[PDB]
């Protein structure tokens, strides 16, 4: 059950300077990069072309190449239209793609944010504002909805091209997506009140279980941290436990994960 995300970030600093940068994710693996400095979209995995032929990919890349130049000029012109209401610097973010389900089911989305706030989406056959959006956006929405050629292209991208492409992606990248890499654990301590820390690192995929333990008894003062990434697309996590100094004897950190195949990791203090 995987989500395909195209994440676009655009900065317009003043009327004559801007950049647009994109990265694309399938679940938590990066499949594409598109730096402002590059004419073309970059594959970050061998399978990032999916099951599209070289000619189909060219046509798709070309549509995006036209989009990027056009988006840039359109924002610049919409700014002029609303002036002096709204002004540079401006940050625009797009989150788009499709969430794949079993059978031939999917939901596609195109969400737009302006200065960090979600304000606009494509829905059905048109651009619309969402709850909490300021009223001045109704004029930009009205203008973008005037463009019938863009509406038909976007609808096709959302309804057809995304799910088709993502189905092909999943086939071509099955083995990279289903890989198992093993966690490695280690222990440490910081500041009579100690904090004990169980470090776990190098595990893929993301789901994992980490608890502090006395033999067969889960110490439910354990505070699990956030999942932090490593460069090689594996994960890092730490679970902390508070204790009285001297009382650290007999505590262990137990780590369960799908790559271990039953044989859990236990490290005793």
């Amino acid at each position: 059950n995987y989500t395909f995300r195209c994440l676009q970030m655009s900065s317009f600093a003043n009327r004559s300077w801007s950049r647009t940068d994109s990265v694309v994710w399938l679940g938590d693996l990066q499949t594409h990069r598109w730096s402002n400095d590059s004419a073309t979209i970059s594959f970050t995995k061998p399978w990032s072309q999916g099951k599209l032929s070289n000619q189909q990919w060219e046509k798709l890349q070309h549509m995006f190449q036209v989009y990027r130049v056009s988006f840039t000029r359109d924002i610049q012109e919409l700014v002029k239209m609303m002036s002096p209401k709204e002004d540079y610097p401006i940050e625009i973010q797009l989150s788009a793609g499709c969430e794949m389900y079993p059978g031939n089911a999917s939901e596609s989305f195109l969400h737009v944010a302006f200065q960090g706030k979600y304000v606009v989406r494509f829905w059905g056959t048109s651009w619309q504002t969402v709850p909490g959006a300021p009223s001045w956006l109704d004029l930009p929405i009205k203008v973008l909805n005037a463009d019938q050629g863009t509406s038909a292209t976007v609808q096709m991208l959302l309804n057809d091209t995304c799910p088709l492409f993502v189905r092909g992606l999943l086939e071509a990248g099955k083995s990279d997506l289903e890989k198992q890499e093993k966690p490695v654990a280690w222990l440490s301590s910081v500041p009579g009140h100690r904090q004990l820390v169980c470090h776990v690192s190098g595990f893929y995929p993301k789901p994992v279980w980490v608890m502090w333990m006395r033999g067969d008894q889960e110490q439910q003062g354990t505070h699990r941290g956030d999942f932090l990434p490593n460069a090689d697309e594996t994960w890092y996590l730490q679970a902390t436990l508070d204790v009285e100094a001297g009382e650290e004897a007999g505590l262990a950190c137990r780590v369960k994960h799908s790559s271990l195949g039953g044989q859990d990791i236990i490290l005793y203090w």
Partner: T-cell receptor
Amino acid sequence: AAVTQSPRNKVAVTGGKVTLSCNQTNNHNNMYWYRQDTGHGLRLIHYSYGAGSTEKGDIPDGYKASRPSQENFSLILELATPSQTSVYFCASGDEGYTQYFGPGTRLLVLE
Amino acid sequence: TQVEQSPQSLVVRQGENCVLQCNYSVTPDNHLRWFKQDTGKGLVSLTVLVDQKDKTSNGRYSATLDKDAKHSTLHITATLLDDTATYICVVGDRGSALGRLHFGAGTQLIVIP
């Protein structure tokens, strides 16, 4: 959807102030001024997205624009030159791509 | 320039047909319009072509557009004296008022009565 220009024809002198005006009663937010010269297609001078806004076109130099109301968009030549001898067309439109043109204004600028 | 029109001018006898060419490099290409301009007068719209491969008609004027070739032709059947005019090709790069129009310099037609 009709657009009027005034004056329809004008003779002016170098250094003189010429004001070309455009009126439009359709409640269109957007207006546009072009000049036409032999051997070129129409070229955009200035445009406007609403009252109080003016924007530079492709060839803005020697021209100031002015949008005092929704109805009127004026092209001002503060210090007119012979190179501004041309036919000037104004246009308006709403949020769609169609631009509706006025009938044109001929300007001759003599020494 | 981004919009080239051919021929630059032509002389035809009343009742003959003629073909007018427009080639462009404009990107993107949302729509293409043909104007007629009588000497000293205004821009009268003849037809607007919007599709990938498009055809239109309007009495004696008919036209075509191929977006892949970036090419349009205007055909005038059975020319009349009043077709003496300049014919102008315009390409619009958006389907909204965010667009710019890219004007061709025009083909001059003279019909001999």
